[PDB]
Amino acid sequence: NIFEMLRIDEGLRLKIYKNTEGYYTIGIGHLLTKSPSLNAAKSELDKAIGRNTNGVITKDEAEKLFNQDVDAAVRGILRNAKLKPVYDSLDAVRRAALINMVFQMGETGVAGFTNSLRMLQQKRWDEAAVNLAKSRWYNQTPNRAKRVITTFRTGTWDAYAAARTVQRRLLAFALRKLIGSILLENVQPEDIDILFSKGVLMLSNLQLNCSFLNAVVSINFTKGTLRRLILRLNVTDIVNLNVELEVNGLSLEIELILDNVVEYMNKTASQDFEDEVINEGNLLDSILQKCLASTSVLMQDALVYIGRLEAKLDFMSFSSVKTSRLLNINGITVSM
Numbered sequence: 001n002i003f004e005m006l007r008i009d010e011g012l013r014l015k016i017y018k019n020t021e022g023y024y025t026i027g028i029g030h031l032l033t034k035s036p037s038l039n040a041a042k043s044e045l046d047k048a049i050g051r052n053t054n055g056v057i058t059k060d061e062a063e064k065l066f067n068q069d070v071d072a073a074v075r076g077i078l079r080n081a082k083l084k085p086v087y088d089s090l091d092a093v094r095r096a097a098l099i100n101m102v103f104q105m106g107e108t109g110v111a112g113f114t115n116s117l118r119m120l121q122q123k124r125w126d127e128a129a130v131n132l133a134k135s136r137w138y139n140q141t142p143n144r145a146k147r148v149i150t151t152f153r154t155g156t157w158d159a160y161a162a163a164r165t166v167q168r169r170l171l172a173f174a175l176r177k178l179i180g181s182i183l184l185e186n187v188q189p190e191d192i193d194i195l196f197s198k199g200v201l202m203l204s205n206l207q208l209n210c211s212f213l214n215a216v217v218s219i220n221f222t223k224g225t226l227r228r229l230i231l232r233l234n235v236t237d238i239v240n241l242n243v244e245l246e247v248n249g250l251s252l253e254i255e256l257i258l259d260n261v262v263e264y265m266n267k268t269a270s271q272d273f274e275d276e277v278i279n280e281g282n283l284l285d286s287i288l289q290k291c292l293a294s295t296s297v298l299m300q301d302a303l304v305y306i307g308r309l310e311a312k313l314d315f316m317s318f319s320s321v322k323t324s325r326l327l328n329i330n331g332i333t334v335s336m
């Protein structure tokens with residue numbers, strides 16, 4: 001369906017980001033503001049929820065904002081005079097492509113494509129596709145433009161499936177690099193391939209990379225050992241990403257929030273990922289953000305030392321709830 005398509009095109013991001021046009025945007029392609037002042041952006045989100053945020057949202061809020069943005073899109077199309085005749089005639093797929101464009105560039109601006117809108121009422125797909133290739137929008141999002149145009153041309157979901165495959169490939173690269181970064185163990189592409197072929201990947205007798213932890217948590221970690229690590233991907237629906245990370249037998253030693261993680265990799269891997277992404281034929285930043293945003297975390301039988309005090313944890317979980325994700329912890333006993 002359409003939400004899948006737009007998820008592919010826009011992706012997901014938890015912090016405030018500059019969209020395809022350069023304007024300030026949040027969530028799954030929700031455009032906050034046309035203004036380029038950062039704090040001037042803070043208005044639409046805060047208004048949407050009703051509480052002071054400093055520019056951050058939750059996943060369900062991004063999904064709600066998604067559904068709502070598509071609803072505003074359909075309001076706009078029916079409101080708009082030149083497009084509604086063009087739209088009323090079309091089938092689900094082409095309708096979806098139109099909705100995508102209107103979603104992307106807004107109600108007001110899209111109605112300027114008179115030549116092509118008319119070209120679409122008459123159902124002249126080919127030369128329409130040639131003409132849309134010669135448009136400011138192709139300049140904005142040439143890849144996306146090519147996909148939407150393809151959708152308009154053939155009338156099926158052929159163009160976006162390839163994008164789905166690409167998403168899988170990139171996500172695999174990102175997960176290999178990330179798990180690689182957390183641990184001292186060598187994670188081959190074959191194991192992540194296992195994580196994608198079968199839903200599960202379990203690594204055992206591992207060891208945390210203390211440099212990673214020191215950089216992310218930021219407070220000195222001495223050593224970290226994890227008995228068992230379980231990763232799971234909603235492979236059946238990779239576009240609506242759901243990640244399941246689980247750590248059993250965590251063993252942290254310490255001597256005396258998420259965004260920085262993204263920063264670290266952004267530094268260290270962006271080049272190599274770029275080297276790979278070009279090889280396959282700042283991109284890694286989006287993938288990682290969607291990944292870490294989609295993940296729900298579990299941990300069992302952890303052991304932490306601080307210094308030295310000892311904290312023993314029976315079970316903990318990190319999931320989304322009704323100003324952020326909730327960290328529920330069970331079975332803490334602290335001793336010497």
Ligand SMILES: CCCCCCCC/C=C\CCCCCCCC(=O)OC[C@H](COP(=O)(O)OCCN)OC(=O)CCCCCCC/C=C\CCCCCCCC
Nearest residue numbers: 014058182247257258259292295311324325326327332334
């Ligand atoms: C130790 C872990 C070892 C395993 C390492 C692999 C994990 C890393 C791989 C993926 C990580 C994915 C994490 C998902 C994001 C978590 C971010 C976070 O820390 O919470 C931030 C979140 C902000 O909202 P979000 O929308 O969830 O953030 C997303 C964008 N910032 O803020 C929170 O909810 C934090 C809640 C409090 C966290 C601090 C809790 C203190 C630590 C232990 C509890 C205290 C125990 C004390 C017992 C007594 C001891 C004497």
